[PDB]
């Protein structure tokens with residue numbers, strides 16, 4: 001991920017960010033996630 | 045959230061609820077970006093017209109909460125606030141320019157499967173994901189319509205980012221570069237919008253580079269909810285990251 005904040009000021013997790021334990025962490029996609037992905041594929 | 049759907053358990057572990065202590069009252073949405081810092085909408089804490097000028101101990105916050113009526117044990121967390129930080133250039137009198145605010149928890153929260161922080165974008169990710177057409181995701185406990193009333197379960201809806209020229213023409217409000225709008229156009233056959241109560245809530249996008257969720261915006265304003273030819277407005281998180289930085293290093 002790479003950092004912007006200083007842990008002592010900021011806390012923890014600038015690095016455990018953005019990864020759902022019940023989804024990404026378990027390699028499981030959520031029910032509408034794909035819609036976002038597919039929006040990255042222009043007007044195909 | 046109008047025209048959205050219930051949220052899966054843990055699909056938005058960074059969801060935070062801004063509560064008012066006395067009387068107990070749900071105020072706004074918010075997001076967890078750290079174990080101690082929470083992001084939200086400046087007008088959630090300061091908006092004189094609506095008699096809003098809260099202080100540290102007027103409010104409390106709740107994290108990892110799944111329903112809105114039942115207390116969920118060693119799942120949800122209730123944290124007090126040590127300090128509040130509103131952008132010094134927040135324009136509440138005019139266009140809500142720089143509608144952003146930071147809150148420091150009095151005591152850090154332990155992450156779990158239901159509680160984790162969302163990522164803040166960097167230069168590359170920002171310029172790469174903030175492109176009209178691309179869809180993001182908004183979440184909240186706000187109204188389901190223009191006032192069912194409000195949900196008993198966190199609501200979610202994905203909406204496309206709209207091009208500035210289009211957003212600018214849809215409202216008579218002075219739109220600034222520190223904000224962006226999102227929503228479907230009347231010709232797209234899909235609906236959905238944030239609404240009253242959703243302010244402070246996050247607008248997140250999933251990065252294909254690392255599979256992580258980044259908070260690109262903060263629910264800020266709109267005219268009505270899910271009205272044809274209208275769009276919701278969100279504070280542009282990246283353009284205000286220097287400020288977020290200053291506030292955090294300063295604290």
Ligand SMILES: *C[C@@](*)(O)[C@H](CCCNC(N)=[NH2+])NC(=O)[C@@H]1CCCN1C(=O)[C@H](N)Cc1ccccc1
Pocket residue numbers: 072087088138139140217237238239240241242243244263264265266267268269270275276277
């Ligand atoms: C405080 C929030 O809950 C709410 C979010 C609205 C989101 N709406 C849609 N359609 N996505 N914000 C507000 O209600 C803000 C606070 C000030 C008034 N307001 C508005 O959005 C007005 N309806 C419009 C407006 C007034 C002044 C400046 C900017 C916008």
Ligand SMILES: *[C@@H]1O[C@H](CO)[C@@H](O)[C@H](O)[C@H]1NC(C)=O
Pocket residue numbers: 092097
């Ligand atoms: C907030 O309330 C404090 C008084 O307790 C006041 O000094 C400050 O001017 C208020 N902020 C405003 C109205 O913008």
Ligand SMILES: [Zn+2]
Pocket residue numbers: 053110116119
């Ligand atoms: Zn639960």
Ligand SMILES: [Zn+2]
Pocket residue numbers: 032035201202
């Ligand atoms: Zn959708």
